[PDB]
Amino acid sequence: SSSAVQLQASGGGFVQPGGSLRLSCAASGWAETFGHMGWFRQAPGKEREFVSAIDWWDTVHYYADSVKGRFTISRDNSKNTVYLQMNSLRAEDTATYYCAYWDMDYLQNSIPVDYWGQGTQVTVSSAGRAGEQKLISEEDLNS
Amino acid sequence: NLCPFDEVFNATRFASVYAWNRKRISNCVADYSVLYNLAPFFTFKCYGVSPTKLNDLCFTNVYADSFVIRGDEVRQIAPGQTGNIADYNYKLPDDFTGCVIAWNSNKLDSKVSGNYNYLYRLFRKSNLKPFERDISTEIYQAGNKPCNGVAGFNCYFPLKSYSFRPTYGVGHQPYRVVVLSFELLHAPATVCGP
């Protein structure tokens, strides 16, 4: 009605505890203002939980307490893309990560989001994808 | 006939904000679907109207003011704002009806060696009236003594250049702005979407 924004996500997959990952989200279309971009996440069975946000001009940064000091949210200077640098990932970071956009100049709370992107799966564990790398050597099997 | 909307948006060069352009419209049909495919991401804020139903509207006059400012400062192109741009370069009225279009122009208006051709006014004895224009380059008298047209202490050149380099942050990158204002003369019209 007064905006029309598409969000395209990239990044994700399977990593080990302590590893790093970079998520990206691109915004396109039109809006009322150069609003905020950010990420939510949803653990299996749990509810969606705020992760991080940033104003369009990379002057304001918000982080959830569960990721303060480990996650960093930044912006590209030649692309309409926002980035989430994920360091020292733990098992509890395993969730579906959703990109989000607020068509506001100032972000009071995380709650009436204007637009989402499709989910992006991030899994932190030692096992990996059920199925990938089916051939396990007998030497690796013991050591 | 179609309105020359591309003459305003697809113009090669844009003016400085202190000397903002002004394109009169007349004798043409105005469809805004051309506007929607303009940038990968741009802002379209309207005051009193919605950008969708605004295609079914009739007008007697629309004025397209275009200029270049920082992304930091697009916020100042709105009613009731303050700052160097709202006060000393381009003021919108409080009861402003119309829309504002802004989109990143880094690829076009910033240079690795620095684009210094875009200027804004830094000094003025009084804020501008809504829609007033000031292209004067008289030395600003900031102290007790007259300036005699010579720059010095309390005697400053009123204009100052932007620095536009492509490696700057987005807030410091150039943004092309277009302001539509909806004037309704007591006469018939030439601004009606098909």
Numbering used by the authors:
A (entry chain D): -1 to 141
B (entry chain E): 334 to 527
Extract from the study:
The SARS‐CoV‐2 spike (S) protein is not only responsible for host cell entry but also the primary antigen for antibody generation in the human body elicited by vaccine or infection. Here, we report a potent and thermostable Nb, namely, Nb4, which can neutralize all of the Omicron subvariants at comparable levels. Structural analysis of Omicron S protein or RBD in complex with Nb4 suggests that Nb4 has a unique and critical epitope for the Omicrons that is evolutionarily conserved. Based on our structural analysis, in vitro biochemical assays, virus titration and challenge assays, combined with relatively conserved binding epitopes on the S protein surfaces, we conclude that Nb4 and its multivalent forms are broad‐spectrum Nbs for neutralizing SARS‐CoV‐2 VOCs, in particular Omicron strains.
To understand the molecular mechanism of Nb4 neutralizing effect, crystal structure of the BA. RBD (RBD1 for short) in complex with Nb4 was determined at 2.4 Å resolution. According to the previously defined classification of neutralization Nbs, 29 Nb4 could be classified in class II, which binds to a conserved RBD surface area of β‐coronaviruses. 29 RBD1 interacts with both Nb4 complementarity determining regions (CDRs) and the Nb4 framework (FR), with Nb4 CDR1, instead of its CDR3, making major contacts. 29 This RBD1–Nb4 interface is formed by two hydrophobic patches and a hydrogen bond network. The first hydrophobic patch is composed of F32CDR1, W54CDR2, W55CDR2, Y508RBD, F374RDB, Y99CDR3, and A25FR, with F32CDR1 inserting into a RBD1 groove. This patch is enhanced by a hydrogen bond between N75FR and Q506RDB and two cation‐π interactions of W54CDR2 and R73FR and W55CDR2 and R408RBD. In the second hydrophobic patch, Nb4 residue W28CDR1 is engaged in a hydrophobic network, including four RBD residues (Y369, F375, F377, and P384). Importantly, mainchain amine and carbonyl groups of Nb4 G27FR and A29CDR1 form a network of hydrogen bonds with the mainchain atoms of P373RBD, F375RBD, and F377RBD, by which the two hydrophobic patches are connected and enhanced. In our structure, the epitope of Nb4 on RBD1 partially overlaps with RBD1's interface with ACE2, sharing three residues in the receptor‐binding motif (residues numbers of 438−506) of RBD1.
